[PDB]
C-alpha cells in the first residue's frame, strides 16, 4: 500500500535524490530508510 515518487536532478550533476511517500504521516513508519 502507498505510492512512491523520486525527485532527482540530472545524473550528470549529482546522485543525491529525495523520496516522497504518498498517503503517510511522518509526524518506524512504512519507509525504505528514515535518514534525516
Amino acid at each position: 500500500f502507498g505510492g512512491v515518487s523520486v525527485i532527482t536532478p540530472g545524473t550528470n550533476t549529482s546522485n543525491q535524490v529525495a523520496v516522497l511517500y504518498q498517503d503517510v504521516n511522518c509526524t518506524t513508519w512504512r519507509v525504505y530508510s528514515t535518514g534525516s
Partner: protein
C-alpha cells in the same frame, strides 16, 4: 493491478513491460497537461495586486465578491457557495495504511481502489493560490480598468471607467453621469439576486 502480491504471475508478465511503460507514460502526459492547463488559465497576470484600501467606487458594492479577511482562506461569499455546491470524491490526499485496515468490516471505495494500484495525484496549485489569483484579477480590473493587462497598471476612477465602457458600445457618457445612482442600484440588486 494485474496480479499484485504474486510472484509467478510477475515472472510471466515480465514480457509486457513495454505496454505497462507506455500506459504510464500516457497517464503522466495527461497529468502534466492538466497542470499546464490550470497554470495557463489562472496565471495570466503576474503581479499580485492588493485589494483596494478604501471603498468609494461611487455607489457600486463589491463586498459581495471581494475576499473577506475573516476566514483562513481568501474566498468570498460567492466562491464559498460555489465550493459548497459541488462535492468532491477523492476524499483528501492522505489515507494511511492504518486507516484502510481499520475499516475492513465496512466497505469503502478509495481503499479498494488503492489496494489494486489505482492512485490519485494531488493538483499542483491549491485552492488558496487560485483564490489569490482571482482576487488579484478583481483588484486589477476594479482599480485600474483594462490597462493592467497591457504593461503597467494605471489608476483611474471607477465612474470614469464606466463612462469609457459606455462610450465603447456607442452610448454617450452623459447618460452615466446623469444616471449613476440608478445604475449602481441596479447593479447591486443584480448581484444580490
Amino acid at each position: 493491478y494485474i496480479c499484485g502480491d504474486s510472484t509467478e504471475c510477475s515472472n510471466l508478465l515480465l514480457q509486457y513491460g513495454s505496454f505497462c511503460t507506455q500506459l504510464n507514460r500516457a497517464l503522466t502526459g495527461i497529468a502534466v497537461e492538466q497542470d499546464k492547463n490550470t497554470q495557463e488559465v489562472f496565471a495570466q497576470v503576474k503581479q499580485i495586486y492588493k485589494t483596494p484600501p478604501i471603498k468609494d467606487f461611487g455607489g457600486f458594492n463589491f463586498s459581495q465578491i471581494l475576499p473577506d479577511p475573516s476566514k483562513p482562506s481568501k474566498r468570498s461569499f460567492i466562491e464559498d457557495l460555489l465550493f459548497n455546491k459541488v462535492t468532491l470524491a477523492d476524499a483528501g490526499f492522505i489515507k494511511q495504511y492504518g486507516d484502510c485496515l481499520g475499516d475492513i468490516a465496512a466497505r469503502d471505495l478509495i481503499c479498494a481502489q488503492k489496494f489494486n494500484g489505482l492512485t490519485v495525484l494531488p493538483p499542483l496549485l491549491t485552492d488558496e493560490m487560485i483564490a489569490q489569483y482571482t482576487s488579484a484579477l478583481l483588484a486589477g480590473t476594479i482599480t485600474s480598468g483594462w490597462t493592467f493587462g497591457a504593461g503597467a497598471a494605471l489608476q483611474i476612477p471607477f465612474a470614469m471607467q464606466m463612462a469609457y465602457r459606455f462610450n465603447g458600445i456607442g452610448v454617450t457618457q452623459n447618460v452615466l453621469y446623469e444616471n449613476q445612482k440608478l445604475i449602481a442600484n441596479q447593479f447591486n440588486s443584480a448581484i444580490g439576486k
